[PDB]
Design a protein around this ligand. Structure first.
Ligand SMILES: [K+]
Ligand SMILES: [K+]
Ligand SMILES: [Mg+2]
Ligand SMILES: [Mg+2]
Length: 156
RNA sequence: AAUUGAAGAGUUUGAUCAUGGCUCAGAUUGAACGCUGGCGGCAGGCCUAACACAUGCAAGUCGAACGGUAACAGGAA
């Protein structure tokens, strides 16, 4: 049901009296390929435990995306920290034209055709947050019609 | 029918986020070099010395403008 993807594993370190203590971090995303997506970030002493913590957090933090037949509704911009991303709907057969971190998010969410570009910092943790922030704020003609007090047909 | 279009990665720190340069993956060429080399089609071939040039060839034609006859070819001797 849920597609899981491991985006990045990093080794971090803190210093103590006896020397350095290493640990690992894991960044993952989960999604149902139909408009739901979440990301999790886990820390542990061993890689497998870090990944399992991340998968566990991701499943509890999914948001909803209003997709339009495997693509976006309109161009969107997302921002988080140094990361600025841009995404655009594309025609069928285009595929996912996106960088590695944006690709994992877009794919587990069910986006099949999209043109994307990451500006600024490409740190994966912040690119994922910016991507999901762009998808979560995307509007559909339904909600645009509702808030404006108009029918969908007068919108399109 | 004739705008179907947009990917990142490495490297500063014990580790982090940012900033910021450097480096890489692409496409291209009147190319050159190294190794190698079967055939065909279409194109392309002094980018440097507007340096100096042997030899041959690259502009003639008209006798229906004209006086003519060097030919050679006939007509006449
Ligand atoms: K270095
Ligand atoms: K850089
Ligand atoms: Mg930058
Ligand atoms: Mg020349």
């Amino acid at each position: 049901e849920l597609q899981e993807k491991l985006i990045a594993v990093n080794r971090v370190s803190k210093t103590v009296k006896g020397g350095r203590i290493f640990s690992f971090t894991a960044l993952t995303v989960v999604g149902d390929g139909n408009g739901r997506v979440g990301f999790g970030y886990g820390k542990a002493r061993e890689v497998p435990a870090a990944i399992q913590k991340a998968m566990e957090k991701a499943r509890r933090n999914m948001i909803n995306v209003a997709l339009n037949n495997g693509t976006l509704q309109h161009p969107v911009k997302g921002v988080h920290t140094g990361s600025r991303v841009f995404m655009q709907p594309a025609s069928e057969g285009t595929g996912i034209i996106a960088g590695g971190a944006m690709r994992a998010v877009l794919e587990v969410a069910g986006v099949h055709n999209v043109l994307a570009k990451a500006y600024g910092s490409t740190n994966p943790i912040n690119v994922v947050r910016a991507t999901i922030d762009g998808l979560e704020n995307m509007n559909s003609p339904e909600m645009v019609a509702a808030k404006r007090g108009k029918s969908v047909e007068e919108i399109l």
